[PDB]
Design a protein around this motif. Structure first.
Motif, short mmCIF file in Angstrom:
data_model
loop_
_atom_site.label_atom_id
_atom_site.label_comp_id
_atom_site.label_asym_id
_atom_site.label_seq_id
_atom_site.Cartn_x
_atom_site.Cartn_y
_atom_site.Cartn_z
N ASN A 1 40.95 61.70 59.61
CA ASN A 1 42.34 61.59 60.04
C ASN A 1 42.88 62.83 60.73
N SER A 2 42.21 63.98 60.63
CA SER A 2 42.69 65.22 61.21
C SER A 2 41.76 65.69 62.32
CB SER A 2 42.81 66.31 60.14
N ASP A 3 42.30 66.52 63.21
CA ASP A 3 41.51 67.10 64.27
C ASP A 3 40.60 68.20 63.72
N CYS A 4 39.59 68.56 64.51
CA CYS A 4 38.61 69.54 64.08
C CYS A 4 39.19 70.94 64.16
CB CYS A 4 37.35 69.44 64.94
SG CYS A 4 36.01 68.50 64.16
N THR A 5 39.05 71.70 63.07
CA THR A 5 39.57 73.06 62.99
C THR A 5 38.63 74.02 63.70
N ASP A 6 39.02 75.30 63.74
CA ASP A 6 38.23 76.30 64.46
C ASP A 6 36.85 76.47 63.84
N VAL A 7 36.76 76.51 62.51
CA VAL A 7 35.46 76.63 61.86
C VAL A 7 34.65 75.35 62.04
CG1 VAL A 7 36.53 75.99 59.66
CG2 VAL A 7 34.30 77.12 59.68
N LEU A 8 35.31 74.20 62.01
CA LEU A 8 34.64 72.90 62.03
C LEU A 8 34.45 72.33 63.42
CD1 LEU A 8 36.02 70.88 58.98
CD2 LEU A 8 33.75 71.82 59.32
N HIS A 9 34.92 73.01 64.46
CA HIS A 9 34.82 72.46 65.81
C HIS A 9 33.37 72.39 66.26
CE1 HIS A 9 35.48 72.41 70.30
NE2 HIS A 9 36.28 71.44 69.89
N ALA A 10 32.97 71.23 66.79
CA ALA A 10 31.61 71.01 67.25
C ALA A 10 31.64 70.28 68.58
CB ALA A 10 30.79 70.21 66.23
N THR A 11 30.56 70.43 69.34
CA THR A 11 30.40 69.74 70.61
C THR A 11 29.18 68.84 70.56
OG1 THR A 11 31.08 71.88 71.52
CG2 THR A 11 30.71 70.08 73.07
N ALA A 12 29.25 67.72 71.28
CA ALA A 12 28.16 66.75 71.32
C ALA A 12 27.17 67.12 72.40
CB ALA A 12 28.70 65.34 71.55
N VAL A 13 25.90 67.23 72.02
CA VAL A 13 24.82 67.63 72.91
C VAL A 13 23.71 66.59 72.81
CG1 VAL A 13 23.15 69.41 73.49
CG2 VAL A 13 25.38 70.06 72.61
N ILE A 14 23.18 66.17 73.96
CA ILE A 14 22.07 65.24 74.00
C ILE A 14 20.82 66.02 74.35
CG2 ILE A 14 21.21 63.09 74.92
CD1 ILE A 14 23.88 62.12 75.38
N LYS A 15 19.88 66.08 73.41
CA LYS A 15 18.63 66.81 73.53
C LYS A 15 17.49 65.85 73.85
CE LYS A 15 18.02 69.54 70.05
NZ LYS A 15 17.76 69.79 68.61
N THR A 16 16.41 66.42 74.39
CA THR A 16 15.36 65.62 75.01
C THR A 16 14.73 64.64 74.02
OG1 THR A 16 14.90 67.51 76.45
CG2 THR A 16 13.27 65.75 76.38
N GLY A 17 14.44 65.09 72.81
CA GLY A 17 13.75 64.23 71.87
C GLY A 17 12.33 63.97 72.34
N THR A 18 11.93 62.69 72.34
CA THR A 18 10.59 62.30 72.73
C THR A 18 10.50 61.81 74.17
OG1 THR A 18 10.89 60.04 71.90
CG2 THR A 18 10.07 61.69 70.36
N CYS A 19 11.58 61.88 74.93
CA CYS A 19 11.55 61.35 76.28
C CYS A 19 10.89 62.33 77.25
CB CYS A 19 12.97 61.02 76.76
SG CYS A 19 13.64 59.48 76.11
N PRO A 20 10.29 61.82 78.34
CA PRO A 20 9.64 62.71 79.31
C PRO A 20 10.61 63.28 80.33
CG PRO A 20 9.22 60.45 79.89
CD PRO A 20 10.03 60.40 78.63
N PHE A 21 11.90 63.21 80.05
CA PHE A 21 12.92 63.78 80.91
C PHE A 21 14.11 64.18 80.04
CE2 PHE A 21 12.58 59.16 81.55
CZ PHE A 21 13.60 58.75 80.73
N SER A 22 14.96 65.03 80.59
CA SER A 22 16.17 65.45 79.91
C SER A 22 17.35 64.60 80.37
CB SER A 22 16.46 66.93 80.18
OG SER A 22 15.47 67.75 79.61
N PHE A 23 18.34 64.46 79.49
CA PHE A 23 19.54 63.71 79.83
C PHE A 23 20.31 64.38 80.96
CE2 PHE A 23 23.90 62.35 79.41
CZ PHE A 23 23.78 60.99 79.22
N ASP A 24 20.40 65.71 80.93
CA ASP A 24 21.12 66.43 81.97
C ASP A 24 20.39 66.43 83.30
N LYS A 25 19.11 66.08 83.31
CA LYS A 25 18.31 66.05 84.53
C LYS A 25 18.26 64.68 85.17
CE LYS A 25 16.92 70.26 85.11
NZ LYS A 25 17.11 70.99 86.39
N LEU A 26 18.92 63.67 84.59
CA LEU A 26 18.90 62.34 85.18
C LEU A 26 19.59 62.30 86.53
CD1 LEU A 26 19.55 60.11 82.03
CD2 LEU A 26 17.47 60.16 83.42
N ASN A 27 20.60 63.15 86.73
CA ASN A 27 21.34 63.22 87.98
C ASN A 27 20.66 64.08 89.03
OD1 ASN A 27 23.17 61.70 86.56
ND2 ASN A 27 24.67 63.35 86.31
N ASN A 28 19.36 64.31 88.91
CA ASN A 28 18.61 65.17 89.81
C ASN A 28 17.61 64.37 90.64
OD1 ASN A 28 18.35 67.78 90.82
ND2 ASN A 28 16.59 68.23 89.51
#
Lengths: 51, 45
Positions: A1-28
């Motif tokens: 119900n509350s917004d993320c505080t300074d200590v608890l603030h996090a960002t969403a990141v998509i990492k490669t995992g098992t794929c043969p390409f990166s998510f950020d490299k799809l637009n390349n």
């Protein structure tokens, strides 16, 4: 119900995992005959990691 | 599932096996040997 505080603030990141390409490299200028994303594991060739 | 143009994976079937010789899969419901001629053989594996 509350917004993320300074200590608890996090960002969403998509990492490669098992794929043969990166998510950020799809637009390349990567070319596919079929590309299609899902939340279910059936039939998947690979997967990214959401962190 | 195989259609006129595509194959799509829908489910999974899991297998548990142990190597050996007790159980044998067969074409349908053995000790047939052809001698002195070329033959495709399966002899004790």
């Amino acid at each position: 119900n509350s917004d993320c505080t300074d200590v608890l603030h996090a960002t969403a990141v998509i990492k490669t995992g098992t794929c043969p390409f990166s998510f950020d490299k799809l637009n390349n200028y990567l070319t596919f005959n079929k590309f299609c994303l899902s939340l279910h594991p059936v039939g998947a060739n690979c997967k990214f990691d959401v962190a | 599932a195989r259609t006129r143009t595509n194959e799509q994976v829908v489910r999974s079937l899991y297998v548990i096996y142990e190597e050996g010789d007790n159980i044998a899969g067969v074409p349908s419901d053995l000790s047939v040997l052809h001698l002195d001629s070329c033959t495709d053989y399966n002899i004790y594996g």
